[PDB]
Amino acid sequence: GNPLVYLDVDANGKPLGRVVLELKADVVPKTAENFRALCTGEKGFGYKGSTFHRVIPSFMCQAGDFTNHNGTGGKSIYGSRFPDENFTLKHVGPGVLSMANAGPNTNGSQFFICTIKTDWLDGKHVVFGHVIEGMDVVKKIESFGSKSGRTSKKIVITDCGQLS
Ligand SMILES: COc1ccc(OC)c([C@H]2CCCN2C(=O)CNC(=O)NCc2ccc(N)cc2)c1
């Protein structure tokens, strides 16, 4: 059964609500497992307390740099980086959950949630899940972005974990 995980998100210390994500372990088990464990924090590190550092309206909301907190960092549960598992799932529309990277085979912890179909990322970024609940929260996050990706409010994942 594909994991369901959650992110509770704040903007300037005000709760926006919860984003629930299905992780497609049936298609990308290694990538799903990484995200799942980073949500629970069971390895001793993970997403709790980290930010959405790059948010671009009509594109995506990017997060997951819990080491450098600026978009340069993060790490996986396997080591600093891990391979692109496959490109079977596509960036089909809003709600798609996908790994950020710095080129082929550089997956760490950084991820993004799409707010549109981002088809030009197919074959470059590993899609590994989608929003089950909380697109309204994602739209709120999106509304605090800008063309440059700089956020107008501090967007923090206050809590995260696994539902099932
Ligand atoms: C055509 O590819 C893209 C174009 C624009 C863009 O945002 C400006 C992106 C951003 C949002 C879509 C996700 N994405 C990236 O992955 C940009 N790359 C990074 O932010 N790289 C920093 C980084 C460093 C280490 C690790 N492990 C992952 C990412 C990608």
Angle at 31 between CA 162 and CA 9, to 5 degrees: 45
Burial group, residue 55, by CB count within 10 angstroms (0-12, 13-18, 19+): buried
Q: Give the Å distances, CA to CA, from 162 to 8, 109, 157.
A: 12, 16, 14
Q: Is 34 in the pocket of ligand 1 (CB under 6 A)?
A: no
Q: Is 62 in the pocket of ligand 1 (CB under 6 A)?
A: yes
Q: Is 101 in the pocket of ligand 1 (CB under 6 A)?
A: yes
Q: How many helices (H) and strands (E) does the chain have?
A: 2, 8
DSSP character at residue 79: S
How do the domains of the chain map onto residue ranges? Answer: 1-164
Angle at 99 between CA 159 and CA 16, to 5 degrees: 30
Q: How far apart are CA 164 and CA 150, in angstroms?
A: 33
Q: How far apart are CA 155 and CA 141, in angstroms?
A: 7
> Which conformational region is residue 130 in: left (phi greater than 0), alpha (psi within -120 to 50 degrees), or beta?
beta
| Structural biology method used | X-ray
Architecture of the CATH domain 1-164: Beta Barrel (2.40)
Residue nearest to atom 3 of ligand 1 (CA): 121
Burial group, residue 65, by CB count within 10 angstroms (0-12, 13-18, 19+): buried
Q: Is 115 in the pocket of ligand 1 (CB under 6 A)?
A: no
Residue among 62, 72, 111 whose CB has most ligand 1 atoms within 8 A, to mutate: 62
